Structure formats: C-alpha cells, structure tokens
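Thread amino acids onto this structure.
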C-alpha cells in the first residue's frame, strides 16, 4: 500500500531469476498453455517450462514447433518424481545482436542511458524480455525499488504504443504481477524505434 512496502515488494518480485533458452521443442500445446520438452537439469531433476498465455497468442504455436523462451516464473511444481516444472506467462517466440535506444526521465530530468544498455539477438522479441532487461538495469543503476527510494510511479513505453506500469502491484505476488506478460506481446526488432522510460516520486 505505502511507497516503502511497494518498493520492497517489487524489489523482491523482480529479483526473481529469468529463464532463457533459444531452441526448444513444444511438447504439448493446449488452448492457453505451451509446455516445453526437457530444457535441462536443475537440482538433479528434469526441468520443464509451462507458458500460460491468451488463447489468441497460443494460436500461433503448435506441438512440435521449435521456440525460444525468455520469461520469469511465478510458480514451480516438484510433485513430479525427478522433475520440476516452472510456470510462466508468455515469453515465447519462434526459434530463429541489436541495441535498442533508450530514453530515460527520472523525476522530470532526462538521464543518459548507454547505447548498449538494452539489447537482444532476436528478430521477434517479447515485450517481456525487454521489460525484464530494463528493470534489471533500472534496479542496478537507478535505485528502482531500492530501500530508501522515493519513487512511486513510472512506465516503460515501446515507441514503435505498448507499455508497462513499473509500479503495478496487482495482488502483491508473482502470479498477479507477472500476469501482464500473458498476452505474449512481441515486436519485430526493426520496428522498435526506442524505449521511453519515466520514473517519478
């Protein structure tokens, strides 16, 4: 509710680990979920990723398709013997480097962002991938969600406009906060002019 609590909440939420795999086959595809085949082994067990997405978005994929994954999980299942499945939202692009210029304003003042701050080697990249890379950067270099930070609002805008509210807290958990990635929104790398970011106290 209060600024302090929201910062601690989001700082923790966005400290969550990110999964990045460039070539995996879809084992199962249902109306609104994609489940990968084994990605690798984590803590001695077969690791699989389940992606939940709008039916409209899920319609683009089918079992057997080769895809790339870039997403953050909100749950895990260890109930399966010798296996662990992580649940995520979207983060799926067809199997296949470029810097994306960033404009940043903090409390009304424009701040320079280095040329190579945000990049991706995909031709079709999800808004999720970019948002995760952006927040990681803002947390590490501009005190976003840091204790003792006065920030209370902000947004990341994709200037092709699509955007993410940097202080959306939903039901105060990963399941609700990462749900904004459910649309599996993506862009062709060449159609993204730059990213506009604003953070305000």
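Threaded sequence (201 positions):
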């Amino acid at each position: 509710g209060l600024e302090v609590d929201n910062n601690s909440l989001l700082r923790n939420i966005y400290s969550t680990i990110v999964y990045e795999y460039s070539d995996i086959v879809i084992d199962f595809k249902t109306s609104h979920n994609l489940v990968t085949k084994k990605l690798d082994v984590r803590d001695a067990r077969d690791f699989f990723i389940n992606s939940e997405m709008d039916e409209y978005a899920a319609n683009d994929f089918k079992t057997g398709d080769k895809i790339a994954v870039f997403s953050v999980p909100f749950d895990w299942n260890y109930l399966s013997k010798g296996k662990v499945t992580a649940y995520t939202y979207g983060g799926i692009t067809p199997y296949q480097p470029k810097n994306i210029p960033v404009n940043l304003w903090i409390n009304g003042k424009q701040i320079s962002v280095p040329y190579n701050e945000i990049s991706t080697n995909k031709t079709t990249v999800t808004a999720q991938e970019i948002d995760l890379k952006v927040r990681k950067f803002l947390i590490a270099q501009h005190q976003l969600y840091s204790s003792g930070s006065s920030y209370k609002s902000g947004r990341l805008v994709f200037h092709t406009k699509y955007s993410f509210d940097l202080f959306y807290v939903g039901y105060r958990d990963k399941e609700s906060i990462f749900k904004v990635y459910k649309d599996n929104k993506s862009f062709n790398i060449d159609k993204i002019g730059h990213l506009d970011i604003e953070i305000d106290s």
